[PDB]
Design a protein around this ligand. Structure first.
Ligand SMILES: Cc1cn([C@H]2CC[C@@H](COP(=O)(O)OP(=O)(O)OP(=O)(O)O)O2)c(=O)[nH]c1=O
Ligand SMILES: [Mg+2]
Ligand SMILES: [Zn+2]
Length: 1025
DNA sequence: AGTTTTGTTTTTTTTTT
DNA sequence: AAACAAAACT
RNA sequence: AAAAAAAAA
DNA sequence: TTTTTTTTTTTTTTTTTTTTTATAAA
DNA sequence: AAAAAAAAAAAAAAAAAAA
DNA sequence: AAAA
């Protein structure tokens, strides 16, 4: 079965022929003998045909010379068989060499192109580095399976039969009891879309809407069974979009899809931590055609606009703008309530749906859509999509016969996640409505359910009655929906006053009782909240230690190892902070940094100080992650939710009410409270507040009355003023006191405000007028806001909040450090200005795109290398002499510049610089640091000079302690290696005009100095000429 | 008149289901 | 994390 | 070796 | 209930002690 | 020579006692 | 070498 090889899309001739035939197919064929649904499948056939004809012809053309030479040679050598002739034996000898020459040159180019690709990526957070830490990928196979007979057997046809028959059976059984489905849907109260929303769903698809979905498709994904890639649609979107628009208009009008839209390829994924050999345990992941996914993406985006009307905020999975940590913190707060409660009769139950996406009954799903009020062209298209889907299973690369998908949503489809949620929402609403399933009461809050996708947790009081009624309702839902739970795999915490009472409830109920802990959404919930640190954070330290211990001999530098910590460790650390932001002891951070540094410096003491690595300005953009500042950024982030005061955030309201419940709405940018006994038992919120204050006083802010103080605040309420006035001001004029206006602008800022001014309750203006015009009020409110205050007040999106706060914290806590560039200036007798020190830092960033070349420069400037002077101090000795043996004292400036063994190389480089007909002083700061005197600071030739100098640095460093001269030829080899890596990358990225500028002059000079012997031995030949 | 800063956009990997 | 472009401050 | 949302660099 | 004193914790600064054996390539 | 760690000082918040 |  064919696939498009994306490499063909690059090639100038291939593109021109395809663009020509796409025009020619549609102009010829398009008429009313054909439906557009048929015509689209006919187009794809012709297009797949032409790619095959183009690929084959291209491959012939590339081989034509060796084709000819091999034919011509064998002809002459058969002439040898009758009579053996000297001149022919010469001619045969000549050509047989040239055949071997061409085969060599093709081989080398393939190696150099591969090395060039790796040279761009090395030590970067990219697929190569990610693959280095991971084990070898698998090619999925079956050779042994466990049989319907109960046998473990290995016959190839018997496995193909046993797999297919099993998956065919899973999807086969569609329910038929439509009248019972209606009865369940009438039993309960459900939302409805209104006429404006429904009109939005059914609106005509447009050409601009299609191109936006094409632009966003994920590159480097497998194609569907027809073998066209996302890269194809992106390449030809100019031709394809007019015809695609005609396709979707025809589907809207008729509700008939093309036959290919139904097709999908199942590949079998083994589930984590379970048997391969059981057919029981695989996940079927589907590949669909890209044209069908374009349509399905259109429909999913439309319904996503409305989804918050349909789905209650107890569901956070798949929902835009929601967070999984919302459910984790809510659940921990409920568990604390039970721990505190004097009379215990309570249960917490974790439930998961078995094969949830596969077992949804499609007729129930379509009835649900109508009941919510979705009908018209949108419902018509959804019904067509489910009319007859089929799968083929691809096993060991072989394509099995196809079966119908009569249950389930399509498990690799963009529309399937939302459709599953809408169906599950019918059960969620029914549980909330039913009052003999009793929730837990937390002051003014009742809590019953939290959902994440198909994952469900339930909070009950008086479980003996309440849990039985829950099970009964789920049975009724199962009969109509198809949804099913495994009750034994469902885990519960049970709380009772006596052991007798526990034994009764356990006897009656089907659930598994967890004494210590339940794993949930990535974390451990504990039966007592005291345990949170022990179960979550202590295990996380132990797991990081083992992980770095395995990696300890991995072959990358300290630069690459820093990136490994960022890529692999940092995400799981942040996730745990965000789920459970409890006060952590200082020893936790001490152990985490010791472990991480010991890995980066390969169990040897650091070569560069962690102080210098702290800031991006220093060390060329390599930065070490600060775990304490990430912890502070996560704890402080909660304050953004307190200021927003959103009705969806029930997780924030859930902490112990005991003295006073409202206070968190009043804390931020609002007046200090005398009472200091709120939050006595707070797990999260009290620690958040203490961190917020400490940062504000570090900044020397007054946090308590600000340009962002709300009208809905204690400041206005301690003025004893009627809520009708408060609401009037917000309705008319906006929410901040600065929107009212203070001092001389009290209402006068707009006519709309003075239009408001008369309206308000008579005496309350005199109260307001006094406060708003007071001398202290004008001073505090009129000041300019800081960047810190803008984070919490200004932004309507929680998006990207940890990264903003962390960037502020790094400036607030910015430390002083030693500068290596100053020590260089002392090793030489010279002063570097601020402009010189700026040039050194920029150069260390901009010397290359490759981290390989950048690392070498960074090590040179930052004084990485050991010296005899340093080593004699360490060993407590007086033998500080140059290791090369020239007899002088081994300072760092001796080792790089001044040693007589190194000096002949540097003079060689200055001879080339005269052949480029530059002129530069002979000054160690230019090649080692990148600091030029004030004339040459501008010059265009610096990119050439940078390549010459960094090549010299490599040559000297390679024989650092050796009693021999660095040679000129080793220097030319390095400079030619860099030239080669840059050439293939410059083509791949279409940069060849830049490349020719830098290298062209230098390349001519390198070739002029070598002999033909040397050029042959070291394979030095032009890639430009 | 010149350089630095701030924001958006395109590309990588990891977390949950 | 990088690059590019727009606006303000030195 | 596919889908959705979220997070960081 | 309010104000002042005392005690504890955290963060920053300064001084003292210890190191590593060459490096880049892989 | 250079980096890290330990020790001491300084400041602010919280608690208890007195006015 | 650490991809497709
Ligand atoms: C992990 C994962 C999940 N999904 C979707 C589709 C199903 C739901 C539920 O997945 P679940 O872990 O419950 O598994 P489930 O299918 O419900 O089977 P069991 O719950 O193990 O019976 O999430 C997916 O599309 N891709 C994935 O890689
Ligand atoms: Mg499930
Ligand atoms: Zn020397």
């Amino acid at each position: 079965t064919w696939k498009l090889n994306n490499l063909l899309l690059n090639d100038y001739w291939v593109h021109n022929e395809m663009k020509a035939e796409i025009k020619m197919f549609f102009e010829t064929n398009e008429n009313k003998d054909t439906t557009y649904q048929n015509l689209w499948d006919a187009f794809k056939a012709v297009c797949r045909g032409k790619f095959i004809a183009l690929n084959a012809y291209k491959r012939k053309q590339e081989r034509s010379k060796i084709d000819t030479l091999t034919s011509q040679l064998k002809e002459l050598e058969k002439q040898e068989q009758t009579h053996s002739k000297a001149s022919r034996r010469q001619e045969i000898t000549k050509i047989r060499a040239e055949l071997k020459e061409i085969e060599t040159q093709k081989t080398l180019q393939k190696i150099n192109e591969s090395r060039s690709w790796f040279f761009e990526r090395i030590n970067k957070i990219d697929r190569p580095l990610a693959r280095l830490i991971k084990k070898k990928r698998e090619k999925n196979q079956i050779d042994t399976i466990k049989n319907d007979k109960g046998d473990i057997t290995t016959d190839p046809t018997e496995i193909q039969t046993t797999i297919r028959e099993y998956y065919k059976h899973l999807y086969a059984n569609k329910l038929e009891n439509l009248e019972e489905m209606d009865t369940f849907l009438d039993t309960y109260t459900l939302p409805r879309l209104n006429q404006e929303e429904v009109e939005s769903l059914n609106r005509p698809i447009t050409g601009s809407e299609i191109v936006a979905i094409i632009n966003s498709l994920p590159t480097k994904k497998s194609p569907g069974p027809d073998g066209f890639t996302a890269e194809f649609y992106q390449r030809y979107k100019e031709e394809l979009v007019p015809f695609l628009l005609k396709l979707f208009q025809s589907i809207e009008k008729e509700g008939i899809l093309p036959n290919s839209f139904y097709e999908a390829s199942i590949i079998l994924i083994p589930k984590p931590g379970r048997d391969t050999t059981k057919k029981e345990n695989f996940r079927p992941i589907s590949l669909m055609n890209i044209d069908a996914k374009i349509l399905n993406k259109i429909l999913a985006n439309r319904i996503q606009q409305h989804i918050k009307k349909l789905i209650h905020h107890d569901q956070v999975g798949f929902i835009p703008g929601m967070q999984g940590w919302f459910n984790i913190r809510k659940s921990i707060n409920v568990i604390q309530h039970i721990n505190r409660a004097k009379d215990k009769n309570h249960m917490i139950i974790s439930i998961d749906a078995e094969k949830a996406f596969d077992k949804i009954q499609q007729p129930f799903m379509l009835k649900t859509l109508n009941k919510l009020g979705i009908d018209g062209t949108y419902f018509k298209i959804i019904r067509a999509i489910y009319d007859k889907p089929t799968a083929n299973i691809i096993l060991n690369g072989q394509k099995l016969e196809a079966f119908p998908l009569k249950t389930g949503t399509r498990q690799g489809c963009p529309l399937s996640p939302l459709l599953f949620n809408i169906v599950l929402e019918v059960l969620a609403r029914a549980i909330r409505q039913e009052k003999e399933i009793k929730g837990i009461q937390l002051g003014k809050e009742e809590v019953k359910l939290s959902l994440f996708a198909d994952d469900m947790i339930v909070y009950l009081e008086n479980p003996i009655v309440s849990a039985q009624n829950l099970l009964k309702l789920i049975s009724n839902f199962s009969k109509v929906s198809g949804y099913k739970i495994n009750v034994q795999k469902s885990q519960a915490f049970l709380y009772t006053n006596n052991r007798q009472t526990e034994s009764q409830i356990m006897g009656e109920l089907p659930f598994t009782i967890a004494s210590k802990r339940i794993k949930y959404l990535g974390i451990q919930l504990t039966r007592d909240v005291k345990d949170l640190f022990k179960e979550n954070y202590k295990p996380l330290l132990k797991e990081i230690k083992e992980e770095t211990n395995k990696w300890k001999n991995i072959p990358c530098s300290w630069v690459g190892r820093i990136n490994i910590v960022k890529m692999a460790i940092l995400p799981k650390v942040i996730y745990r902070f965000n789920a459970i932001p409890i006060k952590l002891p200082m020893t936790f951070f001490t152990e985490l940094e010791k472990t991480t540094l010991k890995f980066i410096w390969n169990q040897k003491r650091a070569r560069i100080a962690k102080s210098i690595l702290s800031q991006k300005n220093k060390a060329g953009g390599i930065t070490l992650p600060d775990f304490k500042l990430y912890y502070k950024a996560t704890v402080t982030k909660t304050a953004w939710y307190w200021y927003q005061n959103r009705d969806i955030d029930q997780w924030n309201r859930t902490e112990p009410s005991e003295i006073m419940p409202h206070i968190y709405n009043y804390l931020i940018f609002d007046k200090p409270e005398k009472n200091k006994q709120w939050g006595k038992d707070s797990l999260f919120n009290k620690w958040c507040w203490e961190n917020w204050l400490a940062i504000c006083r570090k900044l020397k802010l007054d946090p308590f009355l600000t340009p962002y103080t709300k009208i809905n605040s204690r400041w206005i309420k301690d003025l004893n003023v009627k809520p009708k006035t408060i609401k009037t001001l917000e309705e008319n004029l906006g929410i901040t006191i600065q929107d009212i206006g203070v001092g001389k602008d009290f209402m006068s800022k707009t006519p709309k405000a003075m239009a408001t001014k008369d309206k308000i309750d008579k005496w309350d203006l005199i109260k307001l007028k006094s406060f708003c015009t007071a001398k202290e009020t004008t001073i505090r409110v009129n000041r300019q806001p800081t960047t810190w205050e803008k984070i919490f007040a200004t932004y309507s999106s929680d998006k990207g909040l940890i990264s903003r706060i962390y960037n502020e914290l790094k400036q607030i806590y910015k430390k002083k450090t030693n500068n290596p560039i100053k020590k260089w200036a002392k090793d030489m007798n010279r002063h570097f200005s601020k402009e010189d020190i700026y040039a050194a830092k920029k150069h260390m960033k901009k010397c290359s795109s490759s981290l390989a070349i950048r690392e070498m420069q960074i090590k040179t400037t930052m004084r990485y290398h050991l010296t005899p002077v340093r080593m004699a101090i360490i060993k407590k000795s007086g033998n500080n002499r140059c290791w090369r043996g020239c007899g002088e004292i081994g300072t760092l400036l001796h080792c790089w510049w001044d040693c007589k063994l190194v000096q002949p190389l540097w003079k060689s480089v200055w001879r080339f610089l005269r052949d480029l007909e530059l002129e530069i002083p002979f000054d160690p700061a230019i090649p080692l640091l990148g600091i030029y005197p004030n004339e040459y600071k501008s010059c265009c030739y610096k990119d050439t000079c940078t390549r010459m100098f960094i090549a010299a640095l490599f040559t000297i460093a390679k024989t650092w302690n050796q009693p021999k001269c660095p040679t000129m030829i080793d220097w030319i080899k390095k400079m030619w290696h860099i030239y080669t890596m840059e050439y293939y990358a410059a083509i791949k990225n279409d940069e060849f005009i830049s490349f020719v500028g830098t290298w062209m002059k230098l390349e001519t000079i390198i070739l002029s100095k070598l002999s033909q012997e040397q050029k042959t031995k070291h394979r030095i030949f032009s890639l430009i000429g």
